[PDB]
Amino acid sequence: MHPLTDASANDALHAYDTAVKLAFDRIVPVLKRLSALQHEDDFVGRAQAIALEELGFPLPEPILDTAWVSQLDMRTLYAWCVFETYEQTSEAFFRDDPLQGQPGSPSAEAFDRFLLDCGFHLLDITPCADGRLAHAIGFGLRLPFSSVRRRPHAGALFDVENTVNRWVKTEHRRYREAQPNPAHADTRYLKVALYHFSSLDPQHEGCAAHGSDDALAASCGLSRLKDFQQAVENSFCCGASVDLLLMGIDTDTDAIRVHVPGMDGSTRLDRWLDARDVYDATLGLPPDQARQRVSALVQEAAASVPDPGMVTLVARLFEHNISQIDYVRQFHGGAYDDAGHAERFIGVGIGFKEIHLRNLTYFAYMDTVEEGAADLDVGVKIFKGLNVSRGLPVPVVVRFDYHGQVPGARDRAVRHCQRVQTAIESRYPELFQQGLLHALLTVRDQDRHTPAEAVGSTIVF
Amino acid sequence: SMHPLTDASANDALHAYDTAVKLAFDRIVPVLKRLSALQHEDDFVGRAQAIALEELGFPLPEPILDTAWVSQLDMRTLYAWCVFETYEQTSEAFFRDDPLQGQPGSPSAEAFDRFLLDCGFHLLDITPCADGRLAHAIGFGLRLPFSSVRRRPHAGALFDVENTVNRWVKTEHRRYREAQPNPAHADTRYLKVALYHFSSLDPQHEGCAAHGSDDALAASCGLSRLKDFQQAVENSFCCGASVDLLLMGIDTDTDAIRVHVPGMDGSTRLDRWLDARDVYDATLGLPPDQARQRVSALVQEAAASVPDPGMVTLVARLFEHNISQIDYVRQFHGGAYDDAGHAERFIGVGIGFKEIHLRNLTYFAYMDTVEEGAADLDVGVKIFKGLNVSRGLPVPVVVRFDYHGQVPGARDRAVRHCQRVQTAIESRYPELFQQGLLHALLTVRDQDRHTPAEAVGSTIVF
Ligand SMILES: O=C(COP(=O)(O)O)[C@H](O)[C@H](O)COP(=O)(O)O
Ligand SMILES: O=C(COP(=O)(O)O)[C@H](O)[C@H](O)COP(=O)(O)O
Ligand SMILES: [Zn+2]
Ligand SMILES: [Zn+2]
């Protein structure tokens, strides 16, 4: 184990990942047992009892009570079980805080203070929406989830104009509430773009939004970063700038690489500092020195004289990522066998606050189907290979955040969910009519830290 | 025959502008009829261009005229083409000549920003109904310099409450960082106005279609959104944030406004109001100076409860302005618009058009995607089946998206947005489209400058 790895953290995170993934993967084995029993006299009783033992909840009775006519409707049970499993999963995230990083947690308070010391008053991260990066924040960089805005997008192509609007909203809160700090204080908004690549099969397992070309994914991520900065500098008077960070992550090993920037965001696309070289460089050092050597390495990999706080923060991410490297060596032989797509359901809408595990969710950002149906089609094709290949429906969970202070915003969000549902049912009528596609509608009040809310389903009784 | 408060020079200028722009669209059909009668003449392509330049000021597409002999004169395309080119010319004249004399930096806009600040308001954000009979409410009905107000038309005056909260935040941010319009600590409020409409000559049928032509429901739905916005701002920010509200309606037969004067905190009676027609009658035999004081006293007593002094000052100036438009309609339109219903020349889709300030020029449908604007665009398309399709002419559609020129790659996002909308429209009206009865022009406009909108695509190709 590396002298800088948090052993027990690695165990706790492993215990979490295996627990949630077990809940989802126990479904098929249970449904296989039930299918064998559907002609027995006490079928309904024995099925309810199997499901309680195994999944911890019971099944919709109408589907069991009528299995003798049509036969037992497995496609609908499977979707329903995935939805129910997602609800229990999500509710327990807000209830138990498995990551120890909710608002007000010691970890979150600690990191908020550390970000301020480094010269940053907000940390806004866009990873590619790829399911293989959903654990980037909690596992890959070991940051409390609540100390961070996470804004995922296919190929890390975030909305430049909406990010400027988030900068404006952030400054305004500094002006009126001095939250997180006074407006006059010499801190900067920090925008990060996290792309990914595959070290084991770079040609086919890379970022599919950019044809699995590492250079294209790195350079489009930077193009957006620059454009955001240029946009702030052009739209407001006086100082008016932001800090930038372009990072990638290997989906085979979870090692990150940082393009350490100069003070003004000068980034080189062809030179990076890979956490694996960091890992090997500090492996024989006692902890205190190893931390020093990570510092000097990040300093030395800067594109031009770097900002001191940027050097400190990047060194912390390397220090943090070294644990995740050991994580994948411990529990995944140094390379995930699910090198590609193995997600358990599709998520569409706004990013899921509670989803922080690798290959759990295929996320497609969209305000409307009319836009980013391309990104949704990609997932649907993927789940044709994962689920329809073996007779199982494609499960979709729609999510929209709303401001639970705006009167009627919750109502607006719910109706937004049904607007998406109608559009999905229209886009794939073959699958929807063959019962090979179902949607769950969830809304989440983003003004406090409570669980999302299930507001409708294609499964109807 | 003229009210002491009426501004006769302003009335003449605004009449000259409305007249010239409606004449340009109204010449299209008579020109096209003349070309149709000439289509067999040996010199037809030459004659057609010459007439087209003399009468309309732009040329017609060669290939339409060139092939008239085999495939027949394609009037459908010609007509759409001419509406688009006319839209183009008058749109750029608006930016180039400032017919309303209200562009940024104009004397008229300077004065009205000072007056607004003086009344206690640092921003006037108005949502009229998107109905094309209200497009002139700002520049004509209220004689407000267009550049010093935010105009956000929506069907039924149902503006986006969350986005308005975001506008308020953007506004506050400018105040903090730049002191524009004023320093953040100054004691001014953001003012959101909802402007509904109704028809006094046919209430049952010519009112707001979004609300079933039901005046009381149009008024109460506008009020409801205003209160929601106010409740959103108060509940979303510390330290007693608030905003002011104003509900008013305009009568589309006579251009007379009526105001539900509110008390300090926004308290508004729906069931009663102050009609500009009664304010007109009540000041008519008074010198200009007493007429104004009288207007102020009438606003004052009309309030639902004790009003804010600054709000009284502003509403009385809006009444003073509206009195000129009341006289405008009475002298140039017999006192009742002869086109009481819809007579728009084209459908506008997307973001509201900065440059459209004439009555019955544009049926406007707000939308960022067709997936969400469909119902509203259906209504406009239906209206145009009566206005145009019924007589063989296409439904012309101009798409517009504003974009922040200061944001790199934003124009290209707007163009791509326009293309997405074109594709969607074409899919939703597939008969009209392949039958050549629906065309669309794509327009974008940099809202970070005062410059003409740019044409970026068209369903008329060769
Ligand atoms: O970026 C995030 C979380 O990203 P993700 O949801 O993808 O984890 C936001 O800061 C808040 O969570 C949004 O609202 P709220 O403050 O209620 O959480
Ligand atoms: O979009 C602009 C800026 O355009 P520009 O400064 O280039 O004219 C307006 O501020 C609002 O859209 C309000 O509409 P209006 O000003 O027509 O009331
Ligand atoms: Zn990707
Ligand atoms: Zn209306």
Residue numbers in the entry:
A (entry chain E): 117 to 577
B (entry chain F): 116 to 577
Publication text:
Proteinaceous microcompartments, called carboxysomes, play a critical role in CCM function, housing two enzymes to enhance CO2 fixation: carbonic anhydrase (CA) and Rubisco. Here, the CA converts HCO3− to CO2 to elevate luminal CO2, promoting Rubisco-catalyzed CO2 reduction. Correspondingly, microbial and biochemical studies have established an absolute requirement for CA activity within the carboxysome The α-carboxysome contains a highly divergent β-CA known as CsoSCA, characterization of which has occurred exclusively through the isoform from the chemoautotroph Halothiobacillus neapolitanus. Our results show that the Cyanobium CsoSCA is allosterically activated by the Rubisco substrate ribulose-1,5-bisphosphate and forms a hexameric trimer of dimers.
To understand the structural basis for RuBP activation, CsoSCA was co-crystallized with RuBP. Diffracting crystals were obtained almost exclusively in saturating levels of RuBP with the final CsoSCA crystal structure solved through molecular replacement to a resolution of 2.3 Å. The resulting structure showed a homohexameric trimer of dimers consistently arranged in the asymmetric unit with P212121 symmetry. A metal ion is evident at each apex, coordinated by a His3(H2O)3 octahedral coordination sphere, comprising His155 donated by a distinct monomer. The electron density and coordination geometry are consistent with a zinc ion. Density corresponding to a HCO3− ion was observed at one of the trimer apices. While variations in omit map density at these positions were observed, given the consistency of this density across each chain, the dependence on RuBP for crystallization, and the observation that RuBP was an allosteric activator of CA, we were confident in the modeling of RuBP at this site. Most notably, RuBP curls around Lys469, mediating multiple H-bonds with the ligand. The Cys2His(H2O) tetrahedral coordination of the catalytic zinc ion typical of β-CAs is maintained, and the overarching active site is highly homologous between each CsoSCA isoform. Manual inspection of H-bonds within the protein identified a network linking the catalytic Asp246 backbone and the Arg266 side chain that, in turn, binds RuBP, mediated by a water molecule and Leu249 backbone groups.
